[PDB]
Amino acid sequence: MFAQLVAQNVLLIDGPLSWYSDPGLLSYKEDTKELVVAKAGVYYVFFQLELRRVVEGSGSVSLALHLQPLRSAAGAAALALTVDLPPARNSAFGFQGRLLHLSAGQRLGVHLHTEARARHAWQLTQGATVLGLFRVT
Amino acid sequence: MFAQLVAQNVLLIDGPLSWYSDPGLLSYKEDTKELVVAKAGVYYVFFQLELRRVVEGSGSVSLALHLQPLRSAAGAAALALTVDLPPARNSAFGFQGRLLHLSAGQRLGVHLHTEARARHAWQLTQGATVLGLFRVT
Amino acid sequence: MFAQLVAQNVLLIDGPLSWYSDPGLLSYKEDTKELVVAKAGVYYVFFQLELRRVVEGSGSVSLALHLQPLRSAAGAAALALTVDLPPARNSAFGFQGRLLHLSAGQRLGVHLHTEARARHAWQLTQGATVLGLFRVT
């Protein structure tokens, strides 16, 4: 039991990422942009983000994995990655992984936020933003 | 067979980290600040460190995983992470993982060192320093 | 089914890395500098690169994992890591992992490229460049 998805998005538009199964290799829902877990268990979950400067912009970008229905109003992220974008090093890269208890039926969604002096200046390297997981149980 | 711990420490005081089991989810010893492995085997082991600037400080911070009783006077680290702190990007982040042969009964300890022009200026983001592992055997 | 290799190379010479089994712990071929996979399956594959400034140089360094016989003229990398080297932070570090479908008999090779204003100025920290993997199947 495992999965790996690649993000379609290259432009830095805030909100949830759209995914597609990895060509290289539970299921995805294109309508809500939500991965859904079938088997309950402890999963190793990782994601990865590359950025390329395509110009003189700066700031930071954030990925956050949110689990299904929130189950609290607090809205905590199960996984979160921050990457700073230098002003004029034309690339930036983040990797993070950890163990997660996931429930049978639990939807997963990934959100991108960018607080930058130029959201136009950088963009995601196409094919280089990946969410992967496998069951340790 | 797996585990994941979160560091209590936010202040940058040198010496061994204090841990607690992840709320999200072999055993820990609070007295010596040492995780202890029950089953022998090859484990994937990872740790993760986030830092936040809370001011104009700089330098670097280091995490090192040391295995149990040293078994040599050399004192080599099984796992080690270095993160540089820029002077006035208000955050810094390190992730590292690798495969380790671990012995039944082996204690694990994690040490933090900081060589900085202001140890007061940065601190660990609370909940964001994690040590995790699972058996590949 | 797993493996972990450490790179012999410390100097920043372009081309394929030479490896050796991890002292800490399918097979390696010293003649072609190629790891070879025995059992078919989905593997979690990771690599790691540390760099140390040993002087006033700058630029970037790249690792790329290429799979066996190319099977296309395109020559895409299954795994790729980029690390920028600041001019006068005396260290740099990259980690990346993802899930890969690997074929029985498939050779793996890792290539290092450096585009730098001084390839002489930085070098790989000895023992700190690692390629590891384990089967998720």
Swiss-Prot record, chains A, B, C:
Keywords: Cytokine, Membrane, Signal-anchor, Transmembrane, Transmembrane helix. It is a single-pass type II membrane protein. Residues 1-137 are extracellular. It comes from the Eukaryota. The keyword Iron does not apply. GO terms for cellular component: extracellular space; plasma membrane. Its main location: membrane. Cytokine that binds to TNFRSF9. Induces the proliferation of activated peripheral blood T-cells. May have a role in activation-induced cell death (AICD). May play a role in cognate interactions between T-cells and B-cells/macrophages. Homotrimer. This is Tumor necrosis factor ligand superfamily member 9. It comes from Homo sapiens (Human).
